[PDB]
Scaffold this motif. Structure first.
Motif, PDB file in Angstrom:
ATOM      1  N   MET A  93       0.860  -1.176   0.000  1.00  0.00           N
ATOM      2  CA  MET A  93       0.000   0.000   0.000  1.00  0.00           C
ATOM      3  C   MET A  93       0.897   1.227   0.000  1.00  0.00           C
ATOM      4  SD  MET A  93      -1.256   0.387   3.972  1.00  0.00           S
ATOM      5  CE  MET A  93      -1.851  -1.320   4.057  1.00  0.00           C
ATOM      6  N   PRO A  94       0.316   2.418  -0.208  1.00  0.00           N
ATOM      7  CA  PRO A  94       1.132   3.635  -0.212  1.00  0.00           C
ATOM      8  C   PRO A  94       1.878   3.758   1.116  1.00  0.00           C
ATOM      9  CG  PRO A  94      -0.950   4.076  -1.231  1.00  0.00           C
ATOM     10  CD  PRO A  94      -1.079   2.719  -0.579  1.00  0.00           C
ATOM     11  N   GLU A  95       3.166   4.077   1.047  1.00  0.00           N
ATOM     12  CA  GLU A  95       3.991   4.207   2.246  1.00  0.00           C
ATOM     13  C   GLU A  95       3.373   5.118   3.313  1.00  0.00           C
ATOM     14  OE1 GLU A  95       8.296   4.426   1.546  1.00  0.00           O
ATOM     15  OE2 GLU A  95       8.397   5.921   3.155  1.00  0.00           O
ATOM     16  N   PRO A  96       2.806   6.267   2.904  1.00  0.00           N
ATOM     17  CA  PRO A  96       2.195   7.178   3.883  1.00  0.00           C
ATOM     18  C   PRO A  96       1.072   6.495   4.669  1.00  0.00           C
ATOM     19  CG  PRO A  96       2.647   8.335   1.853  1.00  0.00           C
ATOM     20  CD  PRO A  96       2.782   6.857   1.553  1.00  0.00           C
ATOM     21  N   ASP A  97       0.274   5.692   3.974  1.00  0.00           N
ATOM     22  CA  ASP A  97      -0.821   4.971   4.616  1.00  0.00           C
ATOM     23  C   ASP A  97      -0.253   3.949   5.596  1.00  0.00           C
ATOM     24  OD1 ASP A  97      -3.229   6.047   3.339  1.00  0.00           O
ATOM     25  OD2 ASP A  97      -2.500   5.112   1.503  1.00  0.00           O
ATOM     26  N   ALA A  98       0.781   3.233   5.163  1.00  0.00           N
ATOM     27  CA  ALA A  98       1.417   2.231   6.010  1.00  0.00           C
ATOM     28  C   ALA A  98       1.998   2.892   7.263  1.00  0.00           C
ATOM     29  CB  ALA A  98       2.514   1.515   5.233  1.00  0.00           C
ATOM     30  N   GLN A  99       2.612   4.058   7.092  1.00  0.00           N
ATOM     31  CA  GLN A  99       3.192   4.752   8.235  1.00  0.00           C
ATOM     32  C   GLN A  99       2.109   5.154   9.235  1.00  0.00           C
ATOM     33  OE1 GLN A  99       4.121   8.857   8.374  1.00  0.00           O
ATOM     34  NE2 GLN A  99       6.273   8.514   8.890  1.00  0.00           N
ATOM     35  N   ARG A 100       0.980   5.651   8.734  1.00  0.00           N
ATOM     36  CA  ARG A 100      -0.126   6.048   9.607  1.00  0.00           C
ATOM     37  C   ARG A 100      -0.665   4.833  10.372  1.00  0.00           C
ATOM     38  NH1 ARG A 100      -5.462   5.881   8.885  1.00  0.00           N
ATOM     39  NH2 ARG A 100      -6.846   7.302  10.037  1.00  0.00           N
ATOM     40  N   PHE A 101      -0.861   3.726   9.667  1.00  0.00           N
ATOM     41  CA  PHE A 101      -1.351   2.508  10.314  1.00  0.00           C
ATOM     42  C   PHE A 101      -0.326   2.021  11.345  1.00  0.00           C
ATOM     43  CE2 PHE A 101      -5.161   2.254   8.222  1.00  0.00           C
ATOM     44  CZ  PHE A 101      -5.144   1.893   6.870  1.00  0.00           C
ATOM     45  N   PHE A 102       0.961   2.138  11.014  1.00  0.00           N
ATOM     46  CA  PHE A 102       2.013   1.702  11.931  1.00  0.00           C
ATOM     47  C   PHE A 102       2.031   2.574  13.193  1.00  0.00           C
ATOM     48  CE2 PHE A 102       6.471   1.125  13.373  1.00  0.00           C
ATOM     49  CZ  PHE A 102       6.469  -0.270  13.478  1.00  0.00           C
ATOM     50  N   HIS A 103       1.805   3.873  13.027  1.00  0.00           N
ATOM     51  CA  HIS A 103       1.759   4.785  14.173  1.00  0.00           C
ATOM     52  C   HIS A 103       0.638   4.358  15.127  1.00  0.00           C
ATOM     53  CE1 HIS A 103       3.635   8.454  11.866  1.00  0.00           C
ATOM     54  NE2 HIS A 103       4.554   7.635  12.345  1.00  0.00           N
ATOM     55  N   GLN A 104      -0.523   4.034  14.566  1.00  0.00           N
ATOM     56  CA  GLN A 104      -1.664   3.634  15.385  1.00  0.00           C
ATOM     57  C   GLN A 104      -1.452   2.276  16.046  1.00  0.00           C
ATOM     58  OE1 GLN A 104      -5.219   4.088  13.038  1.00  0.00           O
ATOM     59  NE2 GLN A 104      -4.823   6.272  12.673  1.00  0.00           N
ATOM     60  N   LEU A 105      -0.825   1.361  15.319  1.00  0.00           N
ATOM     61  CA  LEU A 105      -0.523   0.042  15.869  1.00  0.00           C
ATOM     62  C   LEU A 105       0.401   0.222  17.080  1.00  0.00           C
ATOM     63  CD1 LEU A 105      -0.394  -3.075  15.796  1.00  0.00           C
ATOM     64  CD2 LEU A 105       1.400  -2.835  14.045  1.00  0.00           C
ATOM     65  N   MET A 106       1.434   1.046  16.934  1.00  0.00           N
ATOM     66  CA  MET A 106       2.356   1.279  18.043  1.00  0.00           C
ATOM     67  C   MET A 106       1.615   1.861  19.240  1.00  0.00           C
ATOM     68  SD  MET A 106       5.374   0.254  17.429  1.00  0.00           S
ATOM     69  CE  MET A 106       4.487  -1.144  16.653  1.00  0.00           C
ATOM     70  N   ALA A 107       0.700   2.788  18.974  1.00  0.00           N
ATOM     71  CA  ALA A 107      -0.069   3.411  20.047  1.00  0.00           C
ATOM     72  C   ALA A 107      -0.824   2.347  20.825  1.00  0.00           C
ATOM     73  CB  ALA A 107      -1.040   4.427  19.475  1.00  0.00           C
ATOM     74  N   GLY A 108      -1.454   1.429  20.098  1.00  0.00           N
ATOM     75  CA  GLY A 108      -2.212   0.368  20.737  1.00  0.00           C
ATOM     76  C   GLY A 108      -1.328  -0.602  21.500  1.00  0.00           C
ATOM     77  N   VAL A 109      -0.196  -0.981  20.911  1.00  0.00           N
ATOM     78  CA  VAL A 109       0.718  -1.907  21.578  1.00  0.00           C
ATOM     79  C   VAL A 109       1.341  -1.266  22.827  1.00  0.00           C
ATOM     80  CG1 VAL A 109       2.832  -3.263  21.316  1.00  0.00           C
ATOM     81  CG2 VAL A 109       1.179  -3.187  19.458  1.00  0.00           C
TER      82      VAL A 109
END
Ligand SMILES: O=C1NC(=O)c2c1c1c3ccccc3n3c1c1c2c2ccccc2n1[C@H]1CC[C@@H]3O1
Lengths: 264, 5
Positions: A93-109
């Protein structure tokens, strides 16, 4: 107000050798919630852990009710579906989208680890999206407490999903909980950026994994990933869990902090 | 199918 406790099950959200998840709509308010139906023919522990959860990037738990042999878990409905379906095969997927999803995943973890809970099965199928594409960590059926009364408990149970599991799970009798979830998040990042999983499992017997340890990034899926995020993956996917990057340091990573995604 | 909360 009569009828407010009545919900119609109008659609199957999930199904497997364990039960099913139905979309329930309130007869009066039309509010939408997910209802996990499990035939107690485990659940107690999952409910216990869900009662501890309160975070914007973790599927909300409204409550539960049981009628004999069937347990009903009322969970937050994420209309966007699974992150798994936003990943284009062999593309990502677009890198920017992946980065946003990764930021949220980290927040949850970070949140989960903060209250001493480890998910143990982080993968795209267990990361759901709401109407605004906000990520929500889902399914705590394999989750467990790794810290209680400020004391850490080493884990030994082999569980998770092979492609996403950390190498120490297959090589050591005991291991720390946190680095294992960090590893899984790294595999999810790889999938989002390359549209493919790097290996069947992190074993020296697996050629794909040996190649990575040998730093052959000219091969897929690594050659499809830009230098910035690849440098982060090099820090996350480290065999020795004690040398593996921690979340506090992932937050300091160059790619993690690179402006890429415009607001909605 | 239906359920009560
Ligand atoms: O929205 C959800 N809240 C939820 O709580 C939820 C949800 C979904 C879901 C939404 C759209 C497409 C497939 C979906 N699944 C689930 C799901 C859950 C859930 C909770 C506990 C165990 C398994 C679970 N599943 C499974 C996995 C994927 C699919 O069924």
């Amino acid at each position: 107000v009569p009828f407010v406790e009545d919900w119609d099950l109008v659609q199957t959200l999930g199904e497997g050798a364990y039960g099913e998840v139905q979309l329930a709509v309130n007869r009066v308010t039309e509010e939408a919630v997910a209802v996990k139906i499990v035939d107690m023919k485990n659940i107690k522990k999952e409910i216990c852990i869900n009662k501890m959860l309160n975070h914007e990037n973790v599927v909300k738990f409204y409550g539960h009710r049981r009628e004999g042999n069937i347990q009903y878990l009322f969970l937050e409905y994420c209309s966007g579906g699974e992150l798994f379906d936003r990943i284009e095969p062999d593309i990502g997927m677009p890198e920017p989208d992946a980065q946003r999803f990764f930021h949220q995943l980290m927040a949850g973890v970070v949140y989960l680890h903060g209250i001493g809970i480890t998910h143990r099965d982080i993968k795209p199928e267990n990361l759901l999206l709401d109407e605004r594409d906000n990520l929500k960590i889902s399914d705590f059926g394999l989750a467990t407490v790794f810290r209680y009364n400020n004391r850490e408990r080493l884990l030994n149970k082999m569980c998770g999903t092979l492609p996403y599991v950390a190498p120490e799970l297959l090589k050591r009798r005991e291991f720390h909980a946190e680095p294992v979830d960090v590893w899984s998040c790294g595999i999810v990042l790889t999938a989002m950026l390359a549209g493919e999983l790097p290996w069947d499992q992190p074993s020296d017997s697996c050629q794909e994994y040996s190649d990575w340890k040998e730093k052959k990034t000219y091969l897929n899926p690594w050659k499809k990933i830009d230098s910035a995020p690849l440098a982060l993956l090099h820090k996350i996917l480290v065999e020795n869990p004690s040398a593996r990057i921690t979340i506090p340091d992932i937050k300091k990573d160059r790619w993690y902090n690179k402006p890429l995604k415009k607001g909605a | 199918a239906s359920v009560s909360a």
